[PDB]
Design a protein around this ligand. Sequence first.
Ligand SMILES: [Ca+2]
Ligand SMILES: [Ca+2]
Ligand code: NA
Lengths: 236, 245
Amino acid sequence: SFIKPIYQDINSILIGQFEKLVYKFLKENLSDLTFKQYEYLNDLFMKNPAIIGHEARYKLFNSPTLLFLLSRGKAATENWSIENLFEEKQNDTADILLVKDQFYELLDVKTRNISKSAFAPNIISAYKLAQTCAKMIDNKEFDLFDINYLEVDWEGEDLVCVSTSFAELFKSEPSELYINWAAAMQIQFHVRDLDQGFNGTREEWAKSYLKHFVTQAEQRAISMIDKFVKPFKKYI
Amino acid sequence: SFIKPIYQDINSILIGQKVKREPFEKLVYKFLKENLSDLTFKQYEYLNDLFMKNPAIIGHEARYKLFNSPTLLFLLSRGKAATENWSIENLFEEKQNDTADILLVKDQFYELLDVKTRNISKSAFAPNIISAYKLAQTCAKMIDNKEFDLFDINYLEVDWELNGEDLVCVSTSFAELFKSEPSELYINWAAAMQIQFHVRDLDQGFNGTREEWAKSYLKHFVTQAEQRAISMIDKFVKPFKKYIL
DNA sequence: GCCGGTTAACCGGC
DNA sequence: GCCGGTTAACCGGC
Ligand SMILES: [Ca+2]
Ligand SMILES: [Ca+2]
Ligand code: NA
């Protein structure tokens, strides 16, 4: 992580001291590496004005996996112009991107209202993560990027920060990730609760996640009969 | 439908309306309020009015009995603690996962309206209409309690496009869920098991009774669930086994 | 034309 | 404590 080293600094400037308000901090203390996902894409294409067409521009990523996680559609990529730049997207994989010397940190910020009942938010699609692990293995890309999370807790007429949390997805035990199939097949968890005791290699994590994903896929399929078929059979 | 008789006018008044550069639902509410003041309510407003007129009824248990309908209780009520803690000083407010956007009621009959805004400037994408599971439970409760002439679930689509520093409405569509062919409803399991369709495209030729609609939907639901189960193996299991064996 | 996955984030049952 | 369903629409591959 590029943020981990300066976590204390961020935590001390947030607690009490809005959404993406952390981006400001990062874009000032790491202005050299901080980007919104859409800003990184514009930056990458502006730097190579000689490369046109989506097929060519996609090659700019130099990584089938990163291409998969960060790129926009073919049309959007081909239609990309210097006078027609990319804008933020609700569907974007990451909130903030930190890249240095060909290594990437996909950072997601999660805001939690410590006043309401605890309800783990959608973290990332378990399916997208499976395709990611598959691409990591197929292309042997095990030392290219990390997916990390920064949690910001908040709470009379103003909403101030009370604490923060930071965790790395790849440091968590794969089989411990809760996949909520109904909730758009999303992994869900509060950052503060995310396990960080995995000790294996990045390759072992990917294989372990795939076994977990496949197993949960089987379990969900069977459970659908139990909850969506059995109780309604008597009406038909 | 209660808004049906005055639909042509809603359509005319809505086309042209603008919002500061989703909120069109509030404008929909506005008109209905001025044209059907006594039948129009936000879902939370309806709940507040019901409890306000029965101040002596306290506790979630007693308050739940005020709905005098298992199906309506299921579709409209807030949780037990929320119902327990309600008070004139602690009223209900909008809730993200409430079933309906607007309720129109008259003489014990209910119309649950869900406004569906649509950005007409982009590639058509059928939005989440309602949970296929919530709908199945609803049909099951209708059958168990014989409530087949109590309520309707309808949709009002508001099409809009960017026009300067605001969004403007270019057209609208209205359709009724119970007039559609149940077996043709698209259930997108990944998308929170939601039924998906464009109001403008929903068929309206069902020829059976409400009871028949419920049974037919239940048949469709169960069949699609069975298919999804097996389908999950082909899409989420088979393609990744090569990485764990 | 056809088809379905993704983000953001949120209560409430027992 | 443990567990999971719901609303809002929305996009891009072949
Ligand atoms: Ca996020
Ligand atoms: Ca709506
Ligand atoms: Na809905």
